[PDB]
Structure 1
Amino acid sequence: NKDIVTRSNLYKKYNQVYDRSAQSFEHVDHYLTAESWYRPKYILKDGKTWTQTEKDFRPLLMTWWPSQETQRQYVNYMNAQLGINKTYDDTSNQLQLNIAAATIQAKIEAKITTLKNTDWLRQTISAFVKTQSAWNSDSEKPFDDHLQNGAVLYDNEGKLTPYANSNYRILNRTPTNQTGKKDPRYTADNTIGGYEFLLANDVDNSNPVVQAEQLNWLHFLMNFGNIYANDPDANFDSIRVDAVDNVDADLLQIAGDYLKAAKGIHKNDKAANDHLSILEAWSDNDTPYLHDDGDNMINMDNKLRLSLLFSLAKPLNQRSGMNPLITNSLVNRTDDNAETAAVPSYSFIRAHDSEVQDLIRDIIKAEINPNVVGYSFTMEEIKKAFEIYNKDLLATEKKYTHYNTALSYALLLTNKSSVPRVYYGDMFTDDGQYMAHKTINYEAIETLLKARIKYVSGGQAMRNQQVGNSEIITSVRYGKGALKATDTGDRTTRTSGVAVIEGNNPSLRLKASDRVVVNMGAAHKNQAYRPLLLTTDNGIKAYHSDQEAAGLVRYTNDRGELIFTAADIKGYANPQVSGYLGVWVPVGAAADQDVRVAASTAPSTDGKSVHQNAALDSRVMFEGFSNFQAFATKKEEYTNVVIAKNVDKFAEWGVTDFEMAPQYVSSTDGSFLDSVIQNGYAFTDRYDLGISKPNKYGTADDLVKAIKALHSKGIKVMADWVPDQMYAFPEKEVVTATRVDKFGKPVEGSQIKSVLYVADSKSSGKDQQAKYGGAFLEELQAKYPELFARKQISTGVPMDPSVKIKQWSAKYFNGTNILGRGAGYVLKDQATNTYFNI
């Protein structure tokens, strides 16, 4: 318990602790750590004269050691640090070691007076502690496939840490596994459809008090303008649910219920489309889960992503056939004639995380360091990887980066029955200042986005034709008002629609007798067509008007068929195309032609909130950041400042939904990619949206101006809801902990098995969390009582708003990534085998 901490020290009555008080020890929850300092009764001032101790704290390992072997190692170490040329071996006795320590002590106090400070000794003792297997990674091994090498799970009933107890920490309650059993309804994924421990400090989203706080935070983000700036035009309109497969899926009912109660998205498409919210949910069970739950949010179409990636973007010898582009999707686009698609979705080829950091890892693991752990890169590894990356982008033969980006975007931006999401890093450089440098594909993508507003409407037909040595796909939109190939349309149908012709093989050669006959639809008999995009020897030629293409007009026949031959279609191999891209639009669309349609106020009657109809198809999502954006050097280069200045560009592209980066002030621990490039996903304060300090994207005021500028053009703005984990807490806590895998299963024969461990898991209690934490739970329970009545699926009980989280503490977390502090960091009395409690 509390004894006296010392025949280990022969200056025992000088070096013994000032008093029996707690104020004379650097403790964590009244326990002592190998790095704990204390106030002795006397200091050996300048290693000369025993002086009698104000702010004169000294290391405990100066005068106390857990084992005699540790004293030896401490003597050997500090001898080498202070220039004492003498080591002591295995057979040395206790008197020799005590005199060695009572010499080290003297020279320590000499250097404290010479150097006039103590930092050097903090670093020297820390360094010594990290050499001992019981106080470093050695006792935390073996490592597992956790992104940060391993995790520890906080025990629900800890006799020595009752303040860290919980009746919850219910793990792996993914949408698939929400009830603690695999859902029998969803068979596309044989697994439990995710895992609890992803990164850093894992928030216990099974805790009813934490569930209430996540809703509190959700309300805050959807009212950020009203709350921060008393400005109702600066609110986030929508959310992205980050890391769905790594959190308790009760948050999906909580967020869906909130959108229904607060925004009325279930009433009609106008409400739903004004607050269009998305998941990042990787399991193939999550889409059908979300559909049954009421389409309160939309998921990615992961099948179409993989179809694009493997048909178009992969290297030439790893490339699949093209037919997946038609059939391997939530929607079979062979003949899509539906007023409303069965399931709503968003579609993409890349995102901030998907096919960016994966490519940087491939480059690092290849040409620099093969022992890289997950995505835990150093900034130097990143900077040099990007020299290889940026050169590969402009190569015809790419070894690392995507082929056929423009072919992918031609399908994404003409496909029916999905909301396309354009990735920032496909129009601008993944690195560098925001919107500073255009990619070689910027023009093609910009042309398609403007064309989409003007031409892309009506039913869809995709065909896969075997011709010459290879294959092509055609994708057609029949024009506004023409759902079917037989619809003869009105005037606007005639001057809308589009044909996309694509091949994914550079050797594609048509025989002289080969015809590609593309049915444009019954509205397009005997009609002039002109190119929008054509593949050339060196890249892609874009056509910004009918007149720019005046020389390349061709005609449909009396059956409404465009016909192409060897003269028109062949394989190419340049930095932009590896195969063929041709895009054709009808001649004579007015300069201001817009075939998009607004969401109706008519009541929804199918029990779903979001409907993949012409109104949702008219939307475009923009992922408005890159992980590897440069840090701003001046205020004009801040992302949110550039966004406000360039908002006219987004409206011109038909961006309806601007997905902003997470706006939380980033932690700087560098324990993951996210906390090295400071994207916003690694944070300590959920409510610090550039308030205490700028985020990577600017000040809180810069954010407010960015949201208002986007709102000024009718553009909705999405907040990144990130309830899975938090990084780099400033206050230590002692927890009873067990070494686990990412699923929370206890490991082999770990020395960390219901033992004390020192976590960084307490917030300051003086941050934005302390101000806004649970601040809106009374307002929410008053307006929307049904939210707090619902018995959540994973727990069987409602959210508990009776407690407010002003300070994060281990009792609200499942556990943490291993911190390299070891299984024995909390000091015991050698004799009693008892943890020191003060």
Structure 2
Amino acid sequence: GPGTWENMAFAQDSSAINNINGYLSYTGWYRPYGTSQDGKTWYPTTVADWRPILMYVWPSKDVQVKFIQYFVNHGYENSNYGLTAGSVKDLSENTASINLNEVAQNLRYVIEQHIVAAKSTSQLANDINNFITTIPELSASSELPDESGYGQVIFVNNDNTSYADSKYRLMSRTINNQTGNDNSGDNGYEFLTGIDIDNSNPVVQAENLNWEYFLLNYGKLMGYNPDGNFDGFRIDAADHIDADVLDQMGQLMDDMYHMKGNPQNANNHLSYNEGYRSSAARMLNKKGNPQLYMDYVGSTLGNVLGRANNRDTISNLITGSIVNRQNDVTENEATPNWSFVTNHDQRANLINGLIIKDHPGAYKAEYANQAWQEFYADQKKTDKQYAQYNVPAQYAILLSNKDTVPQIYYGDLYNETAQYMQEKSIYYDAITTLMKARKQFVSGGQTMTKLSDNLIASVRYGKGVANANSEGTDSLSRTSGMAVIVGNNPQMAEQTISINMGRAHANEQYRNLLDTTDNGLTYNADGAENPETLTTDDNGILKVTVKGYSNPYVSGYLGVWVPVVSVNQDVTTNAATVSADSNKIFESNAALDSHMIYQDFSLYQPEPISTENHAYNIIAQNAELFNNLGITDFWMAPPYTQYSESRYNDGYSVTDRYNLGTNANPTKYGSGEELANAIAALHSAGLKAQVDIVMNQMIGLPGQEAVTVTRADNRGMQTDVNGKTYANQMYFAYTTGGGNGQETYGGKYLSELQSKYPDLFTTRAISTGVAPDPTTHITKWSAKYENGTSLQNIGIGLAVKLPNGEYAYLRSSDNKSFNTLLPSEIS
């Protein structure tokens, strides 16, 4: 006949029981053989009838007790089955098992009543979820977030999860710790956020070369616009990945384009690494500079000019950089670098920040519209609280600085939350003015002289003018060069200053390119304290009148001077095709200094309302504008397909490294067809395009996997979150995925790469001593290619452990290791 034996699983395989690599979860569901509402009648289940494992099986009697009470006190009481707040109140872990199981069974009869009554298992599912949050052990809090709600676990080897084992996982082998011989030092840590990819794994390192080759040939390989090919890379999280891959990328690029001897070929394939750590400069220098180093002078800029209060003194613009500009009168000596006033991450750090001020760390609903209104309202004020002061002055410094490839932020030229390029920012005129002036005037040596604690003169001596005493070698010498005068004190007394324009600019006239007034900036001298033109004396000294002002554009002083000319000039230096040093890839000099990068996106860029609004399409339409502005090198957003639930849908939350969008499923930026065209439009204007390559993480991978984990700090060593920790734990992490793109293109070009450039696969990597391995292709990511994950908000108590200490297990398809062990209550 019938009975409670019907609580067994219908069958002990995946078809009737949820599992992940054979293991069961307390959030899992299974198909009993039958259920009952009263005790007497038992209905054989259909394959559509599933119930939560937490109705039948518990981690401990304590939790079994709390499951019964919480359900009774949330509408599953029924006195006719001895279930009232009163009848369950006194139950405890020391209550008899035989008794507790009688109660849980009787609760199970009422649950079945609710299911029929409400015609679904939905309120039940919702109740289970809520119950789990009350149990510290099963809750997401058991994975031990740190004080700021962050943290990560590492994937370690384990006899239960041996399919996820790795011989590699060499963590924090970054920068100057590639060999693992200075773990304690200035190296930059392994973990940032998301599922961390193991870039020490020879197969992964081979997959990166594949990926890079796909992107350097994107349009050709995809049969889109065949000139729609990236020329180089912008390297995300370069301080946070085994530095082997920065070596390897540079090797591939030198193999493909012959960059080492040829400054022309190098400079046509610019690469730049994100990461200001001074140690990175050191590292890149020792290596012959395969990529540009990311300088910190933008932080100096914000601290000296951008703050409302607490403004670091003016002389920090001279020394507050990987390059000292006291008197920089030499070439090929500075660390080849890229610098900026702003990037995507600085805006975010401000916008988040406004988000927690306005709304007390609460339900993070989308009142990022409110944070943005506040930003835009503050951006226009003279007395700003949040936004940056002196934005034009900062770009004046950035754009006149020798030995750097400067980087403009889309967001500083355009209102980044409006549709792409639909709204210019109030700073567009100023910045673009200075950008054009750079092309025409900014070359030669540099001298930054202090004149007070608040006032500086940054002079460039002009093309082919090495220093203050030089005569002039080029025929643009006389009519090029610039003086940038910046005061960071808005109450600075009016006064007269002297500026040495060099011995090659005696009795020369100077245009007042840009000057400060009561209201802002004037481009023709109207409203300022200086005339449209001034002249130098015999020794090349310029008298200028300066004063403190306070308006939305300037808090202090900004003035800029350039030679009078009747013509357009362009002071770029072509790279000659024979490097002063054949050990170098990149060299800091006039040729490299003639480059300028544009960051073409913001995280808060909105979803396009239509195809006409795809950033890719609008870029293709405005390529000549970018060229006019003096931009040579385009940094394009990570173009990869994203996690559906990502906050900003921005490119950094990667589910498919090869799907750059299709016509019906574009990214925020557009389709791959449209990307390839956008790239080709830029090429058509003589620009180059670099892609943002994200080797560090993947996010929103839909496949769960039973892995074994240790709560670890961000370098990869275990850590204690205030007393507590845990190691060698079963965790049901999202680790597996990649999409058709990883399946279709994974490892596909390694044959071609090997035949064309064998050295890639015989050169031994520093961190491993072993060459990249092209003999396995990665067509799907999983835990075995991953160091770990940022805390996934799941919990560490989900894996069902039998009373005897062993994890519950099921022999299934992939699952074919040990013997099937199921709880007493489900078999």
Instruction: Tell me the TM-score normalised to structure 1 length.
Output: 0.90
Alignment CA distance shift 1:639-1:230 (3 Å)? closer
Secondary structure, aligned partner of 1:135: coil
Query: Take 1:539 and 1:561, find their aligned partners in 2: how far apart are those partners?
Result: 27
Cα offsets for 1:22-63 (capped at 9, x unmatched) = 422111101100011112212448999533223322222233
Query: Take 2:96 and 2:603, find their aligned partners in 1: how far apart are those partners?
Result: 57
In the TM superposition, residue 761 of structure 1 has moved relative to its aligned partner by 0.7
Secondary structure, aligned partner of 1:500: strand
Query: Take 2:563 and 2:59, find their aligned partners in 1: how far apart are those partners?
Result: 83
In the TM superposition, residue 604 of structure 1 has moved relative to its aligned partner by 5.3
Counterpart for residue 616 of structure 2: 640
Cα offsets for 1:128-173 (capped at 9, x unmatched) = 233322211332226266xx622111113x1111101111111111
Pair 1:219-2:191 in alignment = no
Pair 1:481-2:481 in alignment = no
Query: Take 2:757 and 2:638, find their aligned partners in 1: how far apart are those partners?
Result: 27
Mean alpha-carbon deviation: is it higher for 521-530 or for 625-634? 521-530
Amino acid at match of 1:32: L
In the TM superposition, residue 117 of structure 1 has moved relative to its aligned partner by 4.1
In the TM superposition, residue 408 of structure 1 has moved relative to its aligned partner by 0.8
Cα offsets for 1:199-229 (capped at 9, x unmatched) = 0111111111111111111111111111222
In the TM superposition, residue 94 of structure 1 has moved relative to its aligned partner by 4.9
Pair 1:630-2:606 in alignment = yes
**1:809 paired residue among 738, 757, 782:** 782
In the TM superposition, residue 271 of structure 1 has moved relative to its aligned partner by 0.8
Structure 2 portions without partners, runs of 5+: 79-83, 811-819, 821-827
Amino acid at match of 2:164: A
Counterpart for residue 814 of structure 2: none
In the TM superposition, residue 364 of structure 1 has moved relative to its aligned partner by 3.3
Amino acid at match of 1:562: L
Secondary structure, aligned partner of 1:534: strand
Secondary structure, aligned partner of 1:829: coil
Mean alpha-carbon deviation: is it higher for 49-58 or for 253-262? 49-58
Query: Take 1:121 and 1:436, find their aligned partners in 2: how far apart are those partners?
Result: 49
Q: Is the 8 A contact 1:47 1:110 kept in 2?
A: no
Cα offsets for 1:620-655 (capped at 9, x unmatched) = 100111111222222222211221122221011111
Secondary structure, aligned partner of 1:753: coil
Secondary structure, aligned partner of 1:78: helix
Counterpart for residue 180 of structure 2: 180
Pair 1:359-2:358 in alignment = no
Q: Is the 8 A contact 1:792 1:798 kept in 2?
A: yes
Q: Is the 8 A contact 2:261 2:584 kept in 1?
A: no
Amino acid at match of 1:586: P
In the TM superposition, residue 797 of structure 1 has moved relative to its aligned partner by 1.2
**1:776 paired residue among 723, 727, 749:** 749
Mean alpha-carbon deviation: is it higher for 92-101 or for 654-663? 92-101
Alignment CA distance shift 1:738-1:471 (3 Å)? closer
Pair 1:289-2:250 in alignment = no
Cα offsets for 1:512-553 (capped at 9, x unmatched) = xxx422222333222222211110111111249x9x999622
In the TM superposition, residue 698 of structure 1 has moved relative to its aligned partner by 1.4
**1:526 paired residue among 507, 512, 537:** 507
Query: Take 2:397 and 2:15, find their aligned partners in 1: how far apart are those partners?
Result: 67
Counterpart for residue 414 of structure 1: 400
Alignment CA distance shift 1:555-1:135 (3 Å)? same
Query: Take 2:671 and 2:123, find their aligned partners in 1: how far apart are those partners?
Result: 36
Secondary structure, aligned partner of 2:704: strand
Counterpart for residue 815 of structure 2: none
Cα offsets for 1:318-350 (capped at 9, x unmatched) = 111111212332322222222434321111121
**2:418 paired residue among 404, 409, 432:** 432
Pair 1:598-2:574 in alignment = yes
Amino acid at match of 2:347: V
Counterpart for residue 538 of structure 2: 558
Counterpart for residue 64 of structure 1: 57
In the TM superposition, residue 679 of structure 1 has moved relative to its aligned partner by 1.2
Query: Take 1:314 and 1:48, find their aligned partners in 2: how far apart are those partners?
Result: 76
Secondary structure, aligned partner of 2:515: strand
Counterpart for residue 493 of structure 1: 477
Root mean square deviation, CA, Å: 2.6
**2:690 paired residue among 685, 708, 718:** 718
Cα offsets for 1:364-415 (capped at 9, x unmatched) = 343432x58xxxx935252322222222211212222211111111111111
Pair 1:826-2:799 in alignment = yes
Query: Take 2:10 and 2:454, find their aligned partners in 1: how far apart are those partners?
Result: 85
Counterpart for residue 6 of structure 1: none
**1:306 paired residue among 270, 274, 299:** 299
Q: Is the 8 A contact 2:293 2:335 kept in 1?
A: no
In the TM superposition, residue 421 of structure 1 has moved relative to its aligned partner by 0.5
Query: Take 1:378 and 1:664, find their aligned partners in 2: how far apart are those partners?
Result: 26
Counterpart for residue 757 of structure 1: 731
Mapping of 1:61-210 within 5 angstroms? 61-84=54-77, 86-87=84-85, 88-91=88-91, 94=97, 97-98=100-101, 100-141=103-144, 143=146, 149-156=150-157, 158-182=158-182, 191-210=185-204
Q: Is the 8 A contact 1:379 1:676 kept in 2?
A: no
Alignment CA distance shift 1:390-1:55 (3 Å)? same
Query: Take 1:236 and 1:435, find their aligned partners in 2: how far apart are those partners?
Result: 22
Q: Is the 8 A contact 1:276 1:297 kept in 2?
A: yes
Counterpart for residue 444 of structure 1: 430
Identity over aligned residues, as a percent?
40
In the TM superposition, residue 831 of structure 1 has moved relative to its aligned partner by 4.0
Alignment CA distance shift 1:109-1:699 (3 Å)? farther
Cα offsets for 1:692-748 (capped at 9, x unmatched) = 821111122221221111111111111111111111211111112111111222234
Alignment CA distance shift 1:627-1:49 (3 Å)? same
Query: Take 1:46 and 1:433, find their aligned partners in 2: how far apart are those partners?
Result: 61
Alignment CA distance shift 1:392-1:793 (3 Å)? same
In the TM superposition, residue 441 of structure 1 has moved relative to its aligned partner by 1.4
Secondary structure, aligned partner of 1:205: coil
Amino acid at match of 2:614: Y
Mapping of 1:310-349 within 5 angstroms? 310-316=303-309, 318-349=310-341
Counterpart for residue 813 of structure 2: none
In the TM superposition, residue 608 of structure 1 has moved relative to its aligned partner by 0.3
Query: Take 1:709 and 1:18, find their aligned partners in 2: how far apart are those partners?
Result: 61
Counterpart for residue 489 of structure 2: 505
Secondary structure, aligned partner of 1:822: coil
Query: Take 2:475 and 2:216, find their aligned partners in 1: how far apart are those partners?
Result: 42
Alignment CA distance shift 1:645-1:115 (3 Å)? farther
Query: Take 1:745 and 1:11, find their aligned partners in 2: how far apart are those partners?
Result: 52
Secondary structure, aligned partner of 1:420: strand
Amino acid at match of 1:475: S
Q: Is the 8 A contact 1:137 1:822 kept in 2?
A: yes
Counterpart for residue 253 of structure 2: 259
Counterpart for residue 397 of structure 1: 383
Amino acid at match of 1:627: L
In the TM superposition, residue 78 of structure 1 has moved relative to its aligned partner by 2.9
Cα offsets for 1:439-466 (capped at 9, x unmatched) = 2211110111111111222222221113
Secondary structure, aligned partner of 2:626: helix
Alignment CA distance shift 1:236-1:308 (3 Å)? same
Counterpart for residue 3 of structure 1: none
Instruction: Tell me the TM-score normalised to structure 2 length.
Output: 0.91
Counterpart for residue 5 of structure 1: none
Amino acid at match of 1:19: A
Query: Take 2:392 and 2:805, find their aligned partners in 1: how far apart are those partners?
Result: 71
Secondary structure, aligned partner of 1:408: helix
Secondary structure, aligned partner of 1:61: helix
Structure 1 portions without partners, runs of 5+: 1-9, 184-189, 670-674
Amino acid at match of 1:413: L
Query: Take 2:42 and 2:644, find their aligned partners in 1: how far apart are those partners?
Result: 42
Query: Take 2:551 and 2:288, find their aligned partners in 1: how far apart are those partners?
Result: 46
